[PDB]
Amino acid sequence: HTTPWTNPGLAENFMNSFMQGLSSMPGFTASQLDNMSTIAQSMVQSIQSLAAQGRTSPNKLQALNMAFASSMAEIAASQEGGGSLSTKTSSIASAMSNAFLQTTGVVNQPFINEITQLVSMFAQAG
Amino acid sequence: HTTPWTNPGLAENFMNSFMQGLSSMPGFTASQLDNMSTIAQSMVQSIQSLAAQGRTSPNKLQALNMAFASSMAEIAASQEGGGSLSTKTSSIASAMSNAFLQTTGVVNQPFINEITQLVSMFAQAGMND
């Protein structure tokens, strides 16, 4: 239970840290950041409720972390406004990288790469 | 055109309808389905809670519907057990299709394609380390 994918407290820390970091990065409108913040806070509260019920597990926490990251990639790709897709992509990657450093102290680069591929995948579908 | 991210009620109904249908479909273990149902229930409750506060919008709902569908894909692709990846993918796609039909009355094919693409992506990558 040493990572966001196995420890509910660390999953919550990860998502809060991602947002704190993203808030100082370029490419996003106030509206986009509000939307991302609203979503992060709803997913943090949702992991808190499940943890209270003993209803988190590695499999569910993995899927919830992926849900969080996919929804961020989706806002970036679909929501009109702000800077370039490439600026938004770099900003989400830097925010993810700091969220790892703030939690496990170990960046999961393949996961960051995967989220970067999501942004392009979603942008191209829309 | 009307979608699951048009308003909170449609979003919640789509998610519930997806789970109902998937649970009658092949390729999954009881554990994977329990896990998918738990995440679906948490998402619906999140939406009910944002809705009660007037905090939903089409952009936020579209992001949450993606949060939901990605979760489903992640579980299917990565939690060990059940049938083939090919079976899980078509079961997810048929379940999404029915869920549109029961909710809005209209299948959103680009969304179905996105999610089947996610299943592949997530199977290749994993969530390790």
Q: Which domain holds residue A16?
A: 8-126
Cα(A46)–Cα(A42) distance, integer angstroms: 6
Are the C-beta atoms of residues B3 and B104 closer than 8 Å to each other?
A: yes
Among candidates A16, A108, A119, A93, which has minimal Cα distance to B127?
Answer: A108
Domain contains B18: yes
What's the per-residue H, E or C state across A50-115?
A: HHHCCCCCHHHHHHHHHHHHHHHHHHHHHCCCCCCHHHHHHHHHHHHHHHHHHHCCCCCHHHHHHH
Domain contains B84: yes
Q: What resolution in Å is listed for this PDB structure?
A: 2.2
Q: How far is CA B121 from the centre of its chain?
A: 16
* 3-state secondary structure at position A22: helix
Cα(B34)–Cα(B31) distance, integer angstroms: 5
Cα(A43)–Cα(B71) distance, integer angstroms: 12
- Chains A, B: CB pairs < 8 Å: 101
Which residue shows structure tokens 């979503």? A39
Cα(B39)–Cα(A105) distance, integer angstroms: 28
Domain contains B75: yes
Domain contains A1: no
Domain contains A30: yes
Q: Of B53, B71, B109, B113, which to mutate for an interface test with A (greatest number of A Cβ within 10 Å)?
A: B71
Q: Of A47, A71, A116, which to mutate for an interface test with B (greatest number of B Cβ within 10 Å)?
A: A71
| Residue A76's CATH number | 1.10.274.70
Domain count, chain A: 1
Q: Across the interface, do B67 and A71 touch by the CB < 8 Å criterion?
A: yes
Domain contains A97: yes
In terms of residues, how long is chain A?
A: 126
In terms of residues, how long is chain B?
A: 129
For residue B2, what are the CA distances in angstroms to B10, B52, B100, B104, B107? Answer: 9, 22, 10, 6, 10
Domain contains B3: no
Q: How far is CA A117 from the centre of its chain?
A: 14
Are the C-beta atoms of residues A8 and A51 closer than 8 Å to each other?
A: yes
Cα(B118)–Cα(B121) distance, integer angstroms: 5
Are the C-beta atoms of residues A71 and B67 closer than 8 Å to each other?
A: yes
Domain contains A79: yes
For B14-41, the DSSP string reads HHHHHHHHHTTSSS--HHHHHHHHHHHH
Neighbours of B105 (CB within 10 A): 8
Q: Across the interface, do A63 and B74 touch by the CB < 8 Å criterion?
A: yes
Question: Structure solved using which method?
Answer: X-ray
Cα(A119)–Cα(A30) distance, integer angstroms: 19
Six-digit token pair at B54? Answer: 């007037």
Cα(A47)–Cα(A60) distance, integer angstroms: 10
For B72-122, the DSSP string reads HHHHHHHS--SS-HHHHHHHHHHHHHHHHHHHTSS--HHHHHHHHHHHHHH
Cα(B33)–Cα(B22) distance, integer angstroms: 8
Angle between helices B58-78 and A58-78 (to 10 degrees): 140
Cα A42-B111-B38 angle, rounded to 5 deg: 40
Cα A124-A36-A33 angle, rounded to 5 deg: 95
For residue B52, what are the CA distances in angstroms to A43, B3, B55, B56? Answer: 16, 20, 8, 9
* 3-state secondary structure at position A29: coil
Q: Chain B: nearest CA to A76, how far in angstroms?
A: 10
